[PDB]
């Protein structure tokens, strides 16, 4: 029926083209014609449906023509060992997955050149890596969800060689929120969203098929045929850090003489959720931090930030997984209370997100001196499109090789 707080203000075709052609350095037919060449679209010189479809797809924020500013130097590194510093992390992913995605993105390039990359921990690095949100320190602000996904600067001193990723995007490995599991039979392997269990398709973790309320997930596309799974982040299964050694929270638990039935911040200013791992913290003084559940935290709607509540009632019916019921755009949402028919509290469920790996490899191409390829399947192509294979293409290789070795 109706979804309040769902805002539709996405720009019209003309405003979009005007901004896009301005932002990526093209500035209408002459400009459009250039854009179609850069992207290898039919060169019609008209704002056609293929051109609009492209302006509407997520891409890199680095201009296709022109540069961000005047840059110092010949824009090619002149020492082979390049240093990089990861100054901050996105919370959408396990810090280790982030470290690894970047390491792998760098490896695609050290592979076909004499360069090598070594992780460092100071602003000293040749390449400083950072997650930022809108205005983030350099005068080239990001645009909120889905516009440009990131950007980087050519080789050089200062901000040059740096790479920035827009944390308004859901960062992942491109196939749904990255959720490493605990205790399944899957060795800690990550959840495979979407997964099939007893029929149904799940795009998040569920507690159904269980009675203990532990959210789990298949680690393959079909659990029914594979029997491989693991448990998702839950304070009912484990806790992190603290002194409880990982033991699950116990509800309820006494603290400051007060009885809690959920994690809490009382006693902290850093909004971190924690809980006692025994029925009484004052007596036993054992506690741990409640892990965060990214697979089912909604975006947008009138409850951004909150968790899907399953099952939830929609049109008298019961839903136990994210749904697209009630929508014509097929997108997934969930209610953030058990009854949506009365509460109307909802949000959109996490999507595939953007591969931190692919985007980083693309941006590192810039931090090394490369520009945009006009070859659709090449890594240095401007637009984002998720693919499973190795991403360096012949064109990327010819380009990085023209600069190094």
Between 62 and 178, CB nearer to Zn ion: 62
What contacts 109, CB < 8 A, 6 or more positions away?
A: 115, 117, 361, 364, 365, 368, 400
Between 24 and 193, CB nearer to Zn ion: 24
For Ca ion, which residue of 75, 97, 164, 167 counts as binding (CB under 5 A)?
A: 167
Closest approach of Cβ 138 to Ca ion, in Å? 11
Nearest residue to 94 (alpha-carbon basis) of 284, 294, 244: 294
Which residues in the 223-282 window bind Ca ion by CB under 5 A?
Answer: none
Between 158 and 267, CB nearer to Ca ion: 158
* Residue 332 binding target from Ca ion, Zn ion, none, CB below 5 to 8 Å by type: none
Which residues in the 36-75 window bind Zn ion by CB under 5 A?
Answer: 60, 62
Closest approach of Cβ 379 to Ca ion, in Å? 19
Which residues in the 84-113 window bind Ca ion by CB under 5 A?
Answer: 92
Closest approach of Cβ 60 to Zn ion, in Å? 3
Residue 92 marked ligand-binding:
yes
Active site residue 363: yes
| Residue whose CB is nearest to Ca ion in the complex, by number | 147
Q: Does 393 bind Zn ion (CB under 5 A)?
A: no
Q: Does 138 bind Ca ion (CB under 5 A)?
A: no
Q: Does 300 bind Ca ion (CB under 5 A)?
A: no
Residue 372 marked ligand-binding:
yes
Q: Does 143 bind Ca ion (CB under 5 A)?
A: yes
Closest approach of Cβ 120 to Zn ion, in Å? 20
Which residues in the 198-217 window bind Zn ion by CB under 5 A?
Answer: none
Which residues in the 147-186 window bind Zn ion by CB under 5 A?
Answer: 164
Residue 393 marked ligand-binding:
no
Question: Residues 323, 356: contact at Cβ < 8 Å?
Answer: no
**Nearest-angstrom CA–CA distance, 16 and 18:** 5
**Nearest-angstrom CA–CA distance, 153 and 156:** 8
**Nearest-angstrom CA–CA distance, 345 and 153:** 42
**Nearest-angstrom CA–CA distance, 343 and 233:** 27
Write the Ramachandran bin of 20: left for phi over 0, alpha for psi from -120 to 50, otherwise beta.
alpha
* Residue 344 binding target from Ca ion, Zn ion, none, CB below 5 to 8 Å by type: none
**Nearest-angstrom CA–CA distance, 388 and 382:** 18
The annotated binding site is made up of 60, 92, 126, 136, 138, 143-144, 146, 148, 151, 158, 160, 162, 164, 166-167, 169, 362, 366, 372
The annotated binding site for Zn(2+) is made up of 60, 136, 138, 151, 164, 362, 366, 372
Can you give the binding site for Ca ion, defined by CB under 5 A? 92, 128, 143, 147, 161, 166-167
Can you give the binding site for Zn ion, defined by CB under 5 A? 60, 62, 138, 140, 164
């Amino acid at each position: 029926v109706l979804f309040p707080g769902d805002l539709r203000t996405n720009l019209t075709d003309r405003q979009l083209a005007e901004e896009y052609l301005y932002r990526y350095g093209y500035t209408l037919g002459p400009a459009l014609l250039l854009l179609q060449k850069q992207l290898s679209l039919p060169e019609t010189g008209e704002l056609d449906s293929a051109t609009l479809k492209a302006m509407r797809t997520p891409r890199c924020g680095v201009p296709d023509l022109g540069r961000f500013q005047t840059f110092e130097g010949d824009l090619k590194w002149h020492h082979h060992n390049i240093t990089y510093w990861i100054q901050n992390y996105s919370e959408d992913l396990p810090r280790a997955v982030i470290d690894d995605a970047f390491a792998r993105a760098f490896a695609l390039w050290s592979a076909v050149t004499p360069l090598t990359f070594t992780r460092v921990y100071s602003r000293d690095a040749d390449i400083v890596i950072q997650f930022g949100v809108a205005e983030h320190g350099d005068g080239y602000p990001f645009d909120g969800k889905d516009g440009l996904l990131a950007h980087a600067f050519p080789p050089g001193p200062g901000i040059q060689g740096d790479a920035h990723f827009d944390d308004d995007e859901l960062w992942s490995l491109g196939k749904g929120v990255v959720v490493p599991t605990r205790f399944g039979n899957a060795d800690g392997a990550a959840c495979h969203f979407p997964f099939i269990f007893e029929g149904r398709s799940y795009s998040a973790c569920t507690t159904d098929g269980r009675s203990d309320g532990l959210p789990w997930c298949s680690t393959t596309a079909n659990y029914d045929t594979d029997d491989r799974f693991g448990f998702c982040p839950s304070e009912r299964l484990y806790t992190r850090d603290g002194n409880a050694d990982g033991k699950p929270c116990q509800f309820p638990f006494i603290f400051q003489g007060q009885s809690y039935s959920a994690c809490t911040t009382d006693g902290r200013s850093d909004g971190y959720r924690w809980c006692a791992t025994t029925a009484n913290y004052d007596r036993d003084k054992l506690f741990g931090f409640c892990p965060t559940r990214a697979d089912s935290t909604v975006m947008g709607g009138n409850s951004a930030g909150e968790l899907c509540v399953f099952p939830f009632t929609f049109l008298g019916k019961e839903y136990s997984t994210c749904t697209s019921e009630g929508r014509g755009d097929g997108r997934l949402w969930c209610a953030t209370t058990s009854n949506f028919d009365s509460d109307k509290k909802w949000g959109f469920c996490p999507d595939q997100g953007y591969s931190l790996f692919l985007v980083a490899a693309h941006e590192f191409g810039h931090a090394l001196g490369l520009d945009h390829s006009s070859v659709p399947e090449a890594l240095m192509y401007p637009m984002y499109r998720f693919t499973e294979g190795p991403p360096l293409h012949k064109d990327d290789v010819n380009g990085i090789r023209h600069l190094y070795g």
